[PDB]
Amino acid sequence: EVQLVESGGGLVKPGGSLKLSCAASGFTFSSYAMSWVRQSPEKRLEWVAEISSGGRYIYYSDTVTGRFTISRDNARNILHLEMSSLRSEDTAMYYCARGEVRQRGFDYWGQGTTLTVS
Amino acid sequence: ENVLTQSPAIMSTSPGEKVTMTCRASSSVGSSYLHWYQQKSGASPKLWIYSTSNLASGVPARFSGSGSGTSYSLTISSVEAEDAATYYCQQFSGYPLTFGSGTKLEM
């Protein structure tokens, strides 16, 4: 792996919807699981969701278990995160990380995009 | 949710002096399922130590880790100017994944 770049961040309103994207390059995207990690403005890291290599198993955090949807496009090698009912506390920076090996952790992290719900 | 708490949130430091920071977990975390991440100011976090003893590719041998069961810690033999960053412990044993409170080395 070399490059992980997120895109699609912007300004929204409470109760709105937004779709975040994470393009991957330099490695076989289909063979590595992907995860989203959220950094609040207080600099506190919070895990959002994880998608397996093939997408058959999907995991969510308790706060976004019924609100966010994670999806991936193996052919396009792009990772998507979908938000349906963004609340006031969701404003933060989202990073897409590679979590294929659970005993090795998140090897690489992306640049990240800031999200605001003002 | 397995809450992970790191005691020394803010730590003033001087070059050369050894520094150790500990991560406490509210539930049993396996040795192989705990990792630390380094995050420079204005930069995305980067993996530092995984499996509680194995160093990442970029981290020099200056850093080391230890711990098992419910208490974990990583220490610095002699802190350098480039070591000023925020470190977070993370458990990978069970979902939801959780990160520690984080310690920001201010110098």
Add this chain to the structure above:
Amino acid sequence: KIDFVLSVAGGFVGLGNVWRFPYLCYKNGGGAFLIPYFIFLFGSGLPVFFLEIIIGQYTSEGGITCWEKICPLFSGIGYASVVIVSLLNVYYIVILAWATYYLFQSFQKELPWAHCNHSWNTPHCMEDTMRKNTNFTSPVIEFWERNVLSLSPGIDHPGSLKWDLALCLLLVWLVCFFCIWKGVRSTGKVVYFTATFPFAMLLVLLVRGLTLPGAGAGIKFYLYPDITRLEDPQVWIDAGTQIFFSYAICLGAMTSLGSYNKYHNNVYRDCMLLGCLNSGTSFVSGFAIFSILGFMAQEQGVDIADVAESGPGLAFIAYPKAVTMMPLPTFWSILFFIMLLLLGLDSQFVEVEGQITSLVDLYPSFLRKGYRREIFIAFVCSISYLLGLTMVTEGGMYVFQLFDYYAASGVCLLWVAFFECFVIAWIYGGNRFSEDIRDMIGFPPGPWMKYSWAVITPVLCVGCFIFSLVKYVPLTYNKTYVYPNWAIGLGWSLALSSMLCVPLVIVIRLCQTEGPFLVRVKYLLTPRE
């Protein structure tokens, strides 16, 4: 860590290592057998063991139900595994019967096999020491053949039913029945002794073997290859199938074991530890067996390849000769045969329990509806005992050899392993299996396991099967008795009883499914939720 290894110590040594491996090695020229043994070891044995354990953990059910969650079309693999276990449980216990007979014979002032001065002894016998002071016979070999076995001239002459051996089988089967009914197992303080005793006895036997004045020749014959032996299919099938038999894989026992283990364990490391030590103990006990054979060769003045029987009786010829040459031989004979009985009894309990659990899960409506489970256990033990009576007669050795060669070993294990690996790699999908393993244990199998399952194991199994068919040679007891055609047909029937399960289940499920043929096949290929 220590407790986990001790729990392993119940299962990483058995009769397959102490008894089966040495006689297969001796039968196939010694050092020539090791080459295909190690090739199949690292090519297929460990990966298939890991694959079956992963299947068992993934489904968390019996070895027959898991294939429904993997590939409904190939559900016949579990049926083949259960019939393999059923056939194995019939002939495996005869070894414990022989061990029980030897143990009872050991309760004597002098071991009967030490010298030949009895009523059952041929007039051609000559003492090993004085044999080199014609067609003389060693007292131990003919004690095994005439007293314990009463060997018939051929399988066509069953002879009389040995009452003593029948009682030994009855005693062992009664012990198995009571243990299974009451759930008796080594879990208290006794597990330490049960696990440690075999290795203490094996260490003593090995130390005795190497210190003999002729152990060097035996070790040299054990390790030096003969590449002209690799041109015959028998060394390849025997060595490859010994890996499968020793690990108890292709039987479905491992799939059930995976559903009866503690969680959060590093499955990959445990599987490699189990396999590596299981093969290591076999290789180690080979030194003891072949050193004893080498000393026997030096004493008797004959070739190492002709000293003892080239069959299942090797363990009952070499080890008694070893215990005959230790201080107070009766004590060490008693210890050795008690060790053998315990070591085989634990495995027999495991296999019988697995067979019972697999069978009751097929018909829980009646078999598991109440207290009928005990009656079912008694029925299984009784039918197995009656089937085992066939190998107790004077001509029972030939039946035992045929059963060991075909019913629970040989082409059937290659068939089952090939279908398992082919299904998972190609039909279900290696990527899907690796994704499942990621979800379970946290990390993918890696290139070694994936490429093994995809290419190496299917290629090895198909190559061995085709090589055997092209260069077919009939089975022979020892190395001079030629089986009749009907006996070969019966052995092939025993093997086909397991091999035919997959096509029969395939056609049955194809016929028992609605819709067009393509729709039928698609509905049965897609894994269940």
